[PDB]
Write a protein that binds this ligand. Structure first.
Ligand code: LYS
Ligand code: LEU
Ligand code: CA
Ligand code: CA
Ligand code: CA
Ligand code: CA
Ligand code: ZN
Length: 316
């Protein structure tokens, strides 16, 4: 809507207070005019029809329990926008400041979040497996990164290419979590997963096998569930990314870590310059090697550590 930009305040899913950019026109809308062509957050009102209604609030204060998922979806969309702008010089997910739209309160008891090709969609969870998914910055950044991927490499959501797609979203979801310095870790979804159980998460990049996901190519899933294991076999790439960043010895192969910043620069370059819709793990290796070569030189430590990491997870 057309109106005057302002700043509201609310509480997110985890009970934390934050300021959010809003727009005033009779109501205060969750419409952030300060980032690209806008960040818009919608109420899906527990239905599956999208996007729903642009979130309208009478007083610019968002402390109602119903408000919490919208505050975080709106806020963390902004953070993710900031990350891509400031770190990678990318304007929104299409590189041309496309409006970012999110809908919360999608369906009833819905334990997922997704980028549907036009917008982000967040369920509220069933209260036991998940709480509202937008409360996880790595979730929001995971989904918004699918938008980046779909606009750039275009990795299809099947088989190894889909696992790369999912891994990229976990990687950048984690890099955004670190960028926001909000209890950062190499776990995915810990903030909104199983409120009854502390210390777990949906996926682990540091040790994917913690939750039965593969951490070596020899353990990759070859069946047809999950579009050929796109959320399963991502663990192989997540581990490699984790090793590039943090280093370590994995199945007897030692990796000198080069840090998060360089991991992000390498994978962003691989994503936007070298990967294609049907890239597989081996091509991801080549793309990451070439990106590190581009940025740091063929004889650099960075290239060596990328090689070592993929060697460690069995991706030749
Ligand atoms: N986003 C992943 C994991 C979430 C599972 C929620 N039931 C998937 O769709 O499989
Ligand atoms: C990150 C998860 C909470 C959601 C995502 N759509 C899967 O994986
Ligand atoms: Ca209000
Ligand atoms: Ca965390
Ligand atoms: Ca995390
Ligand atoms: Ca938990
Ligand atoms: Zn995903």
């Amino acid at each position: 809507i057309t109106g005057t930009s302002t700043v509201g305040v609310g509480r997110g899913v985890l009970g934390d207070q934050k300021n959010i950019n809003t727009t005033y026109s009779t109501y205060y809308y969750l419409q952030d005019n300060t980032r690209g062509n806008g960040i818009f957050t919608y109420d899906a009102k527990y239905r599956t029809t999208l996007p729903g209604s642009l979130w309208a609030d009478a007083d610019n204060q968002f402390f109602a329990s119903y408000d919490a998922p919208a505050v975080d979806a709106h806020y963390y969309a902004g953070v993710t926008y900031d990350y891509y702008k400031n770190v990678h010089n990318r304007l929104s997910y299409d590189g041309n400041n496309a409006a970012i739209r999110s809908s919360v309160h999608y369906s009833q008891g819905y334990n997922n979040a997704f980028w549907n090709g036009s917008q982000m969609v967040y369920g509220d969870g069933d209260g036991q497996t998940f709480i509202p998914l937008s409360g996880g910055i790595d979730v929001v950044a995971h989904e918004l990164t699918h938008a980046v991927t779909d606009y750039t490499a275009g990795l299809i959501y099947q088989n190894e290419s889909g696992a790369i797609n999912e891994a990229i979203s976990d990687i950048f979801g984690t890099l955004v979590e670190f960028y926001a310095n909000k209890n950062p870790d190499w776990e995915i979804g810990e903030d909104v997963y199983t409120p009854g159980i502390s210390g777990d998460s949906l996926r682990s990049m540091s040790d994917p096998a913690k939750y039965g996901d593969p951490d070596h190519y020899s353990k990759r899933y070859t069946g047809t569930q999950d579009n050929g294991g796109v959320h399963i076999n991502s663990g192989i790439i997540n581990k490699a990314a984790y090793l590039i960043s943090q280093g370590g010895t994995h199945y007897g192969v030692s990796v000198v870590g080069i840090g998060r910043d360089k991991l992000g620069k390498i994978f962003y370059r691989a994503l936007t310059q070298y990967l294609t819709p049907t890239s597989n793990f081996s091509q991801l290796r080549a793309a990451a090697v070439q990106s590190a070569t581009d940025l740091y030189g063929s004889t650099s430590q960075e290239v060596a550590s990328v090689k070592q990491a993929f060697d460690a997870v069995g991706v030749k």
